[PDB]
Amino acid sequence: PLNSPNVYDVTAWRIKGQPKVTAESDIGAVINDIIADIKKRQSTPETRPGAVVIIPPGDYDLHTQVVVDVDYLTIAGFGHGFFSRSIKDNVDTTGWLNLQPGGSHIRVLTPPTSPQAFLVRRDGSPRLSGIVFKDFCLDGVSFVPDGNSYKNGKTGIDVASDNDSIHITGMGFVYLEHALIVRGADALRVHDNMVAECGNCVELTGAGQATIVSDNLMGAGPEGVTLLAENHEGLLVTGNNFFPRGRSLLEFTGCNRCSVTSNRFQGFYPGMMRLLNGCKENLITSNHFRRGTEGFPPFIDRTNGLDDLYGVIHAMGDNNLISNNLFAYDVPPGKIAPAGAQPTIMLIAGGDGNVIATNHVISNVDTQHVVLDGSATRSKVLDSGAASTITSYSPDTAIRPTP
Amino acid sequence: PLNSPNVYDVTAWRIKGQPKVTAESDIGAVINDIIADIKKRQSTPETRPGAVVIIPPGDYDLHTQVVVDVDYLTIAGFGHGFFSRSIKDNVDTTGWLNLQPGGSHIRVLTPPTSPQAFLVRRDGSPRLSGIVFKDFCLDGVSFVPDGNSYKNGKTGIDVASDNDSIHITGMGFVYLEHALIVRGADALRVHDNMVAECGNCVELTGAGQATIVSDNLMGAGPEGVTLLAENHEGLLVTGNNFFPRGRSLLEFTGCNRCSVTSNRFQGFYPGMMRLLNGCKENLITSNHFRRGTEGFPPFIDRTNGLDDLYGVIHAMGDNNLISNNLFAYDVPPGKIAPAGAQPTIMLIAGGDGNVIATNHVISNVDTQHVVLDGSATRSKVLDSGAASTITSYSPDTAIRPTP
Amino acid sequence: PLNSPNVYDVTAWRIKGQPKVTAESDIGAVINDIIADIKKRQSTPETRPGAVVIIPPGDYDLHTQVVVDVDYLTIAGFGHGFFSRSIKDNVDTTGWLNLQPGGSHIRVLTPPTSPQAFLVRRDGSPRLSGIVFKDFCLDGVSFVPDGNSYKNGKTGIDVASDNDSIHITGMGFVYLEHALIVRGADALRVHDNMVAECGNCVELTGAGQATIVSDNLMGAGPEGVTLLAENHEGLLVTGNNFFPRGRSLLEFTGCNRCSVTSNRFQGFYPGMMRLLNGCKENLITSNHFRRGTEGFPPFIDRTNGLDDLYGVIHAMGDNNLISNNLFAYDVPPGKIAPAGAQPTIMLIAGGDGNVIATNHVISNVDTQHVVLDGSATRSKVLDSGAASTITSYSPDTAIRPTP
């Protein structure tokens, strides 16, 4: 294709001894054989620049899990190929000109014994570095036992060992229980992807540093996360459009000194944003939050099991700045839990020194813009509603009502 | 080029029955023939993954409108090829080493009755999904009757059918009356494009959902729009650099629960930002606004017909938050209209519950930072200027002057 | 590879009469020969659409400086190939599977008399236009006399003449004294790059207009700048993750009407953000600032020579809005300079009309959240700390303490 042995076309690669295996029959087997060829040629720590695996547009079955254990592997297609399998699965499709996702289309047909399509893992040293996934489609094909479960035990990309400077861009993920998992992410960029109709979209697990999640379209399922970060420092979440129907849109546990700025959040359940287990010194600013109710009939009675006192934002931690956000709450009074409750927009569930400043709230019913738990200390609430919209169970909250 | 029938090189493709037609002579005919080949091979609703059309760098004439009616079509070049035809058309080009745009360079030479270079449209179902335009140049070549009219009736890309997950990235648009139009956009991304010296840059028409317009350079002409959205819900506009000389830089009509955050706006006329016809619950925050005067001699006496009482931001609708913006106004007193008037920076033209908070204004003349129309109800103006810079003709506006 | 003479593969291109000069031995010489071939074929101002130079993954030595003097040259690899040479140089690498960066990997081995790998420069008109550098790695290989000096006199990309619509995206820069310098930038985009372990990351010198620096990961060295801009107008800095250890993370000199919004800033020294020499009318909003101390043993005793009274933000100029930011200051008393001093978070060193509004500061010791020099005029401090945390030596500062 190019005059370099480090450029692979999955549609041109023949597996020695298995002449019937094609990218169409098992792209997993073809890419593992390509990686074996890389490891054969690149055999010292000063001769391992990696390679690019090109996936032309087409339909490819993946039966065999790909183990990515080399630095600077690029897996690159020519399109994210996103298609709403959720709408297809729930309407009359008579006369429809297309019935599945496309582009550089990998159908994830992994067994339960190796359920991640791409397992990015190296035992040993150093951190896996500079791996790129871009411009292709990972499709779990079906949920179990029906299209509305958001369950199938399949993962698109699982990075399971400490990693540096990974770049996930221009991807499409659809109908995976877990689209993308990255554990121990250092200097990760999840940028300009379509991650929708997955049980869970992006899970940043274990710990992380200096990460950017930007310019993504994401929608998850009601038992799953849209974006989750665990023990991240300096994660920046910006320019994302998060839409239903994750249990949450943004969930941090033990994340400190992170920034969630300039995003759009639309959810159908309480607890769209959760800062859990002592999140400290986070900036939650310049975001648009819309709490609505489900319009799509197959999900109308589906819930994340939380009531409207949980908060649109539910925060437990110290010295977070929740500022300069707009909250638009519109839930029919008969869909509010418990019956006759004032919904909570921002709940300070616990912690010291949290500051809520310049937030504009619109609701169709009487709401508490801010509730602060009895355990909250040295809280500040400025210009985020009339006195009558701010509930401090804590005796020491300083409150400036909107004039 | 690759071992897939779904990868096309426009410079290698021969049209059966028209053997002398090349990408150089009519790339539109070549791409139409390629799309016919895709539809011949991809002949069932479960065998349509689409294809990539590759445009090497070069000068290509497009005479025949391309009709894109297949899902997951990627059209990709290797460069946006942007060149200022505006400077070229208006100065002495003696000894100039280049006189036109380049990269993957499509000269748009469409007939007046089929003027859009790319018409993206399908009659039937489902929505066209996952189409990608990237990394090429669409050039309208000339404006008529002269280079400064911003008129030629040509469009770069016109999406005229309901669409899902379209991605427009790394493009160059120049000297088109309309660069990009997208009707009924759902989960659209207009990302990291150069759209400049077009009459109109980006028109998001009809209605839309869950769209991101991010990281673009845009500049339009005095009778057209830079970014227009009509009846959008959850549109996120972030990281854009909007420069002159559109009639407006951002124009929303009937848009609700949208966000315009972390952009740079430079305009030479009033009405740089317009929220029109009852826009509700939009966040307008963390933007830099610069109102100046035309410095390029060919356009010095051009106007958009609006006076300085119209506003840098003109807002008509309910419950918008306009916060944490900087406005730098510098217009020679002789060019301010009406004669001797104080320019208006933010005009609330009408609507209920709008909040203006924490805005810094600089002006070379005495200005009203905020004017509220008499018809505005339950408005708040916080820390957006001294009492002498806020005019509320509405009697129920709550004003906290900057201390 | 494709049926166009404007598509070059550096691994396929042979220099006629120099068969020993390959991409591997001197990719500089190869690309210079490709540019001579472009110039020979594209011989008139109406036949210069430019070309693409494709860099497959591999290890390539660059001994000869590349002179880019043609419009619409795209130089494109398949991977940024980033690897921490800094960690590699300072820890036990026994059993390490990789010891250097990779991807589309250019080892910069330039002579001291032509030290920039890529010099983008043209004498004559018009401005160089539409040049693209994407998806490859520029590696300076070593700092001298040891890995921790940040010194080698090498530059990755130096744009030395006036330019329009340049695009730098998906790049990796490592172990260069200067990664990227762009003089006289007009409509430049530095987007989604990895620029780390360089003495200086991005220097926007001379003057500039309408530029975007977005979605980058950047880390410099203690004598150098992360992002520098000189006399820029309408620069937008957004979505970036700036980490240590530059002298500063953002340094503006004489920049006016620019915007720094929705970024993450982590530094180990005072003066993380500097608005120097009369910066006017800039927006600094919705940013996360973290001032910490060096944790990586090899750099523990390194400093940028400034004391803790300099400021996390140091501003000298008029009418800047510094609002809606979070500052997390944690420096052990034994590392504060001078010993026993009260650190300053935001210093207004001078100028007229600066506004500081809605800033949340956390500090491990008592700090002055805001200090205004005696020379400051018409300053506003709103909701950026209790009265005991704001010090105005200027008599005309209006202060509203946080309630």
Ligand SMILES: OC[C@H]1O[C@@](CO)(OC[C@@]2(OC[C@@]3(OC[C@@]4(O[C@H]5O[C@H](CO)[C@@H](O)[C@H](O)[C@H]5O)O[C@H](CO)[C@@H](O)[C@@H]4O)O[C@H](CO)[C@@H](O)[C@@H]3O)O[C@H](CO)[C@@H](O)[C@@H]2O)[C@@H](O)[C@@H]1O
């Ligand atoms: O909530 C987001 C979440 O839901 C998913 C599906 O599980 O996305 C659903 C989506 O639309 C829901 C909505 O419409 C469904 C509908 O169709 C669409 O197709 C139309 C025809 O061209 C488009 O014009 C329209 O814009 C599309 O939304 O399906 C039926 C026909 O197939 C129509 O009756 C519907 O219009 O359902 C309610 C019904 O009132 C509407 O408000 C929605 O448009 O959700 C968003 C909008 O809420 C949209 O992007 C999706 O299509 C999943 O992808 C997400 O995770």
Ligand SMILES: OC[C@H]1O[C@@](CO)(OC[C@@]2(OC[C@@]3(OC[C@@]4(O[C@H]5O[C@H](CO)[C@@H](O)[C@H](O)[C@H]5O)O[C@H](CO)[C@@H](O)[C@@H]4O)O[C@H](CO)[C@@H](O)[C@@H]3O)O[C@H](CO)[C@@H](O)[C@@H]2O)[C@@H](O)[C@@H]1O
């Ligand atoms: O003094 C700063 C100094 O200490 C270091 C670590 O030695 O960092 C601590 C840190 O937090 C200080 C902070 O919280 C302390 C602590 O508080 C929890 O318990 C309180 C019960 O009294 C609750 O009120 C509070 O909500 C809980 O978070 O938090 C730690 C758990 O992470 C526990 O070790 C403590 O018990 O002190 C006050 C409360 O007293 C809070 O406002 C702070 O969060 O200091 C910085 C803030 O300056 C913060 O990042 C750290 O976690 C060291 O690095 C510092 O130099």
Ligand SMILES: OC[C@H]1O[C@@](CO)(OC[C@@]2(OC[C@@]3(OC[C@@]4(O[C@H]5O[C@H](CO)[C@@H](O)[C@H](O)[C@H]5O)O[C@H](CO)[C@@H](O)[C@@H]4O)O[C@H](CO)[C@@H](O)[C@@H]3O)O[C@H](CO)[C@@H](O)[C@@H]2O)[C@@H](O)[C@@H]1O
């Ligand atoms: O307002 C943006 C809008 O206008 C367009 C043109 O229709 O962009 C023009 C632009 O600059 C206007 C400005 O400069 C014009 C001038 O400078 C250009 O050319 C020089 C040499 O080729 C370059 O060195 C310089 O950087 C260019 O800007 O062009 C003429 C001929 O070269 C010179 O006489 C000018 O100096 O006009 C005045 C000076 O007359 C300056 O204040 C301007 O810079 O607008 C922006 C800056 O305002 C800049 O990026 C553009 O070049 C169009 O592209 C936009 O939609």
Ligand SMILES: OC[C@H]1O[C@@](CO)(OC[C@@]2(OC[C@@]3(OC[C@@]4(O[C@H]5O[C@H](CO)[C@@H](O)[C@H](O)[C@H]5O)O[C@H](CO)[C@@H](O)[C@@H]4O)O[C@H](CO)[C@@H](O)[C@@H]3O)O[C@H](CO)[C@@H](O)[C@@H]2O)[C@@H](O)[C@@H]1O
């Ligand atoms: O009570 C909420 C409940 O109603 C639903 C629709 O059944 O949504 C309405 C909505 O808006 C409420 C809001 O505006 C009402 C209305 O106002 C227009 O007319 C007024 C009188 O001339 C003007 O003062 C105002 O500026 C106009 O916008 O808007 C409707 C059309 O969109 C008209 O039919 C109404 O007359 O009520 C007050 C004004 O009384 C405004 O602040 C509101 O915008 O409710 C939500 C906000 O809570 C908003 O998104 C909706 O448009 C239903 O969905 C809700 O549960």
Ligand SMILES: OC[C@H]1O[C@@](CO)(OC[C@@]2(OC[C@@]3(OC[C@@]4(O[C@H]5O[C@H](CO)[C@@H](O)[C@H](O)[C@H]5O)O[C@H](CO)[C@@H](O)[C@@H]4O)O[C@H](CO)[C@@H](O)[C@@H]3O)O[C@H](CO)[C@@H](O)[C@@H]2O)[C@@H](O)[C@@H]1O
């Ligand atoms: O309406 C604001 C608008 O007016 C201008 C003048 O057209 O500013 C008026 C304003 O400032 C006056 C002031 O400006 C300093 C000046 O130079 C600074 O910047 C240079 C780099 O760009 C440095 O080399 C120099 O050392 C700096 O002092 O700023 C301009 C360029 O930005 C230069 O033209 C100026 O020389 O002049 C005095 C010095 O005499 C300074 O203290 C001021 O900063 O006037 C009021 C104060 O009365 C102030 O609020 C305004 O900024 C224009 O620059 C503005 O955009």
Ligand SMILES: OC[C@H]1O[C@@](CO)(OC[C@@]2(OC[C@@]3(OC[C@@]4(O[C@H]5O[C@H](CO)[C@@H](O)[C@H](O)[C@H]5O)O[C@H](CO)[C@@H](O)[C@@H]4O)O[C@H](CO)[C@@H](O)[C@@H]3O)O[C@H](CO)[C@@H](O)[C@@H]2O)[C@@H](O)[C@@H]1O
């Ligand atoms: O400050 C940024 C600046 O420093 C550079 C190096 O010059 O980046 C360093 C970095 O980490 C510093 C840190 O840990 C380094 C350390 O750990 C890494 O490796 C571990 C697995 O081997 C990972 O689990 C961990 O996440 C990595 O940070 O490297 C050594 C070898 O592994 C270990 O001894 C270290 O623990 O140093 C202190 C402790 O010494 C920790 O607090 C830090 O994580 O900083 C960035 C994050 O901004 C991270 O990616 C780097 O590894 C340079 O690249 C930057 O300009």
Ligand SMILES: OC[C@H]1O[C@@](CO)(OC[C@@]2(OC[C@@]3(O[C@H]4O[C@H](CO)[C@@H](O)[C@H](O)[C@H]4O)O[C@H](CO)[C@@H](O)[C@@H]3O)O[C@H](CO)[C@@H](O)[C@@H]2O)[C@@H](O)[C@@H]1O
């Ligand atoms: O499933 C809902 C039932 O569970 C309870 C707990 O037995 O509600 C849990 C719930 O709301 C609790 C709530 O109240 C607590 O704190 C108050 C102030 O400190 C105190 O007076 C209450 O006695 C105590 O229960 O939390 C907030 C205050 O933080 C308040 O608004 C709530 O009433 O926990 C979630 C919040 O974290 C809510 O979604 C949920 O309702 C019982 O009350 C429910 O019937």
